[model samples]
Target: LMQFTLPVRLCKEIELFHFDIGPFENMWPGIFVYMVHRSCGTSCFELEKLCRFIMSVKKNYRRVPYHNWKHAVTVAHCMYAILQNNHTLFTDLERKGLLIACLCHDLDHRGFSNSYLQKFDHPLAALYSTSTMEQHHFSQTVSILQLEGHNIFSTLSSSEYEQVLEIIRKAIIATDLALYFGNRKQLEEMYQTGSLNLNNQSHRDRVIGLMMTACDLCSVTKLWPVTKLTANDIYAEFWAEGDEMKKLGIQPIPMMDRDKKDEVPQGQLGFYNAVAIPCYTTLTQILPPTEPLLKACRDNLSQWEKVIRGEETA
Candidate 1:
């Protein structure tokens, strides 16, 4: 199912890393190559410059515990997989927009929360009263594109290029968890009443917004080992933020506080059930091809449940 292979062979543990939307821990460039070809784009990529663009994007990511380059790539791969069977569901422009958004949504992320910026009175928070980091990310996306030889969308005529840039902005902003809360409520109501029609631009746009959150939480749908490891990484980042909070004379929230570790199982339960599952459930209802994502999330939910019940070790 995958045409690409490692330049060197390996044993079982790491050898089979290449596959359709497979491990993004390594081989991101190959996956991006596959995705760019798979996604329809009249504004084509010049492979040489595209490689330069990709490398530039990677270099732009900060070396942080989570929300770094690897996380961005993972989100993009998840989006790639979701678009695989349901490619026709999104328009050519939409697919192209979403993929690019996924890759740069958290560009230059400092591994800090949106709340942290505002609370600390950072200039970035003032630049965007809401979704602070996202505004910066979109700005960063544009900056890289403006760099000579880095505009992968260079082939598009002026009009389409403008539209794609706006689409990228919307998709990046949609990743803000604050927006997700409101969007989720509206989406659920629409689906429950069977009131959604993809033909309507507003309805369709919200669905794409919903998918961004789904892919951001994509690790929850991974195998148990991967899921467990990812959560550990995420928590470590949160705890480090908490440590910073203490130095600022602010009390860290339970989720961010490392000392609150014992409550993680319960916290995860709430997150998976309340945040992750409902998203995939509604997503699968809207797009049946995404059923596997919903299924994996449900399976991972059970794993968390078992950990809480003392029926299994996390």
Candidate 2:
């Protein structure tokens, strides 16, 4: 009787607002432009064209989780950091064009992977037979840039246009995951033999290639907070894939069966350690700043180990 009756849980009326969020935000375009200007001076018409092409992708088709605008921005930022640290390898113009390419390369992507396109015999595969998603993204950005009124390079001199095209094409192709093993092996061999022709190649070529690879593998090399966010986004995508498989009456990707796994992120951590870390560590030795990043990676890996073991809780 002395204990005041617990105030009747007031059926406190709570109003929840569900927001329809677009994948790309307005700030992204401004950030993109600032990054280009700050990293590579003198943004040109073609560069603006590249930005629009990317913006259009974020606006139009953005369902593919890993390859969406976030990935593009991350890669672009990584590329900028790499260039800032290693600018001697590039000339004024090469840096500008390469940055443009880096930001726009994966502008628009369908959810299907290269394996899916190849297996289904999709028309894009036939058109650009040798190139998969990497090339598809590059080519799509180029095609988008070529639209009559939208063509950003139209104002450039023919020679300038050729240079821009050549640099952008090479930069985009360097993102092909299939090329990673070869690129790493070749670069490492060259460094070990003391035969690395940094003089013969623009710094943009050697550094950006390594930088793009690093960004692609950044999850394993980032701060735990960053890694956690990225890992969750990937899991959400994989879960959606699982749902699609169920609908299609097909088997989901082995580790993606949500019901079968006690924890999704744990399985992903294992996969990252098994695959991603090794690649990033090797790249760090070849390209220096990556070394400290790798150390951070070790810390992040240990944190994940605790997470997966349930020694730590969310």
Candidate 3:
């Protein structure tokens, strides 16, 4: 309905990296257009509608310190990279679901965690007892899809439409780090027992859920500069929350404390070992092509160690 042009740099990068591109805002809409067309054979008119829908989605994201449109696009780009790198690993349905879910997973985020919501008695906390933010994100996705000219999946048959929504809901909620740890544990057991079967529909869905978590936190696996930028943005948001908590007479968590900013390298190192390393290591066992993710994480971890030891700054 509206005219839009994809940036030349974005187009070039999409060709080079299959959507792992970056800071290009227009790039995400273009990548989604290509993905929808390739995966679902969407018509030109439908593509236009989908593009408009994506534009609206971007417009609706709040200008938060971190959980903003740029973060959403980055997560989607990571999902696109994984799909591109291992095309045969997922069905067209799975790929479509993953990409769409990634783009919508943090919809309308207020740059606050669920714990903060509960601590302050935010209305959304009362709305969903668990996975509060994730559930709201998925709900916002459904709200957008219901808008006029925004049902990108309108071409889908009744059953296919239901299936896609189901997948999107599961994938979006799986982004919660609390749920991620449990999912990681299950996948780890599957890998250890040699019982993981991609052919099994349930097993495949679980893997897809884990993949969503991996992509959600993909910054840890990115090159150092990108990782550093992402970390800075996240801490900015966290420190803002800490500031608010102090006003409410609540002590902030160590990672969120402004006073602990100097300990960033140490905190990041602990996160790498406790969460990122084990998760990616298990994922590589299931999908060997993803070994590079683990390697990049280790590379970042080593750099953080150096920073901790006064060998480097940042």
Candidate 4:
């Protein structure tokens, strides 16, 4: 089907997140193709087709401030790092689904939250009573896979294809933050009781779901510079939504309000305490190797607190 050569330099760059180089347009496809090839033994011909398919998927992402192709690539890279570091933690099939799901998780996002969609009576809100955008993202993933020569799973047997799609669907939908509290509670309980077994299918699925959310919010656990850049982009997207709501004569939330942008450090401090801390704390409890995520997140939280106090004094 499709054919293109990946640059040798780009392949090296794709192995990690390098903000200065900033060629993620090429990096995403290269990294994805490399992962699939290593994990699945995909042929060169198939690799080319898969790369083109990934490029197509990236192109389909809307040009939003935060949920654009770059964010998708970042999520995919985070999953790749996890998979790479913990190769024995997941089966080959599970690895495939996790990486693909991350790449396609925010496909076609319109820069609006599910609440905003419901408030505006958006069609997607009506289509999915809950997990509205997540369902849309999975549907979009299926749509792209159905395209001619884009079905990378076509090489899979019928049963295997079905299994992969099921896992992908679960992993993608798990990215919804609305479901995070429930997942976090269950995971925390399991970790507390020491009953968390990765061998059990249900337990494995739950862990995978939590991992997806963890990776989706991976920016918070990154270095401060990367976190700051990503956070600004995220708020840019939020402020854009606020602008739209204001046009409709609706009041925006404090985080989304442009007038309150100065409070970003305080908002981030609360976010880290409430969301990031608990998530990574539970994650490292079950998978101690992942404690670095918690460490980095705490470091960033401290940085934000200092900034907030400095601004308060100023």
Q: Candidate 1, residues 163-220: lDDT per residue as tens digits?
A: 8998899889999988988988898899889899999988877888889988888888
By lDDT, rank the candidates, best first: 1, 3, 4, 2
Give each model a TM-score.
0.91, 0.78, 0.91, 0.90
Deviation in Å, model 4, residue 100 alpha carbon: 0.7
Over 1-314, each residue of candidate 3 has an lDDT whose tens digit, in order, gives 33344567664565332235566565567666765554434553366677777888898799898899877877777677667767788776676677779888999998999989999999999999999999999999999989998887787789988998999999998899998888888888988899989999788878988888778888888778878878999999999999888988999999889899998998999999998998888878887877777888899999899889999877
Each model's lDDT: 0.82, 0.63, 0.81, 0.80
- What TM-score does prediction 3 earn? 0.91
Model 2 regions lying over 4 Å from their true place: 1-24, 42-54, 153-156, 202-207, 242-252, 263-266
Error of 4 at 177 (Å): 0.2
Best by lDDT: 1
Candidate 4 stretches with Cα past 4 Å from truth are 1-24, 38-45, 311-314
Deviation in Å, model 2, residue 273 alpha carbon: 3.6
Residue 42's C-alpha lDDT in candidate 1? Answer: 26
| Model 4 poorest 10 in a row by lDDT | 13-22
